């Protein structure tokens, strides 16, 4: 019973203590619905934290750290109970234990604590967890331990309100540059996810990632044999190409577009959608980057997904087509027209999603304004596939922007 | 308006968990 466990765990006889702590750990590690609240309310937390101090009984340290790990794996309230019991400084102490298992379990507990949230993360950082954590990365580290270390790095990178301190990123990026060469799938997935969390933190963090020199090793993972690695890399590089034209060009210079045929035809529709999102962020760039998309022979696949893909992919494809018109040249838009973009691009004007409608209208207006002599031909193409009737119908749209743009389109190009 | 966009909701749903319990026999 919990009363008996708590009483025996406060004993001065460390054998009885160890037995009681192991009983608590068993309760906490037998299934996926442990009685965390009952053990907390019984008053076992300060006892476990005190056990963490017993450098003369590494078994007791290990068992208490296991119990606290599983308590901290629960809700934010339970993790914060652990934190309020002052466990973090003692886990940091245990990071330097001469016993491997104690070190590992302390790393695991700190991982749960850090993963709770950004304020928790910042508290653990201010006490100096990063350098000792990264010191474990050596040729002799066991693979399971290294997987746990990389998971903790993920947790150190992932929250955004606020993002981790710049000093922390400067310490972590070299370790990620080391780990991105590992062939173990788990380590690689977590490394790339940590990178993706850094590249989603802002343009300055994007630039820190670029300056580390890791991007040429990250881009080729778009064609890794493991789909988890592929999608993690797609997230990270996509984040990068949400930035400036120069950062996007850093990505493109690593031959990123060569990896996308196998992603646009992938059986998984979510992957198609994410790849088209990436490419839409590419087509929003300068004429050279639009031309990089064109030369990669990706436009026909994009247009096919626009025509026949699932709705999500069609939305992303509409974004890509329209973004191409931002800085695209008249000959590039003419290539699009040649590839039969108008019929499906206009077909997407009848969906409930008002944002898609706005995007398609913006793209069509840019196409028409860009064409001087072709304008009449493009108008005829729009009318032939029924797009003009859809625009006339949109003239009566609820959304202010949509119907104003429809009126403008019709008045400037379909009213003479 | 047109332009670049950040990661959209629903994309990349298989992220690493923030918390892990150590379960006996797993």
UniProtKB/Swiss-Prot annotation, chain A:
This protein's UniProt keywords: Acetylation, Cytoplasm, Host-virus interaction, Nucleus, Phosphoprotein, Protein transport, Repeat, Transport
Segments of this protein annotated with the region NLS binding site (major): 66-158
A Gene Ontology BP annotation from the UniProt entry: gene expression
Main location: cytoplasm
Chain segments carrying region NLS binding site (minor): 235-323
Tissue expression remark: Highly expressed in testis, ovary, small intestine, heart, skeletal muscle, lung and pancreas, but barely detectable in kidney, thymus, colon and peripheral blood leukocytes.
Sample GO molecular function, one term: nuclear localization sequence binding
Mapped ARM repeat ranges: 1-35, 36-78, 79-123, 124-162, 163-207, 208-247, 248-289, 290-329, 330-372, 376-414
GO-annotated cellular components: cytoplasm; cytosol; male germ cell nucleus; NLS-dependent protein nuclear import complex; nuclear membrane; nuclear pore; nucleoplasm; nucleus
Subcellular location as annotated: Cytoplasm; Nucleus
UniProt domain comment: Consists of an N-terminal hydrophilic region, a hydrophobic central region composed of 10 repeats, and a short hydrophilic C-terminus. The N-terminal hydrophilic region contains the importin beta binding domain (IBB domain), which is sufficient for binding importin beta and essential for nuclear protein import.
Its biological purpose: Functions in nuclear protein import as an adapter protein for nuclear receptor KPNB1. Binds specifically and directly to substrates containing either a simple or bipartite NLS motif. Docking of the importin/substrate complex to the nuclear pore complex (NPC) is mediated by KPNB1 through binding to nucleoporin FxFG repeats and the complex is subsequently translocated through the pore by an energy requiring, Ran-dependent mechanism.
Family per record: Belongs to the importin alpha family.
Record text on subunit structure and interactions: Forms a complex with importin subunit beta-1 (KPNB1). Interacts with SNAI1. Interacts with TALDO1 isoform 1. Interacts with CYB1. (Microbial infection) Interacts with MERS virus protein OF4b; this interaction prevents the translocation of NF-kappa-B complex to the nucleus.
Protein name: Importin subunit alpha-3
Organism, as annotated: Homo sapiens (Human)
Name of the coding gene: KPNA4
Part of the whole protein covered: 72 to 487 of 521
From Swiss-Prot, chain B:
Misc. remarks from the entry: The P/V/C gene has two overlapping open reading frames. One encodes the P/V/W proteins and the other the C protein.
Protein name: Protein W
Organism: Hendra virus (isolate Horse/Autralia/Hendra/1994)
Whole-protein coverage range: 419 to 444 of 448
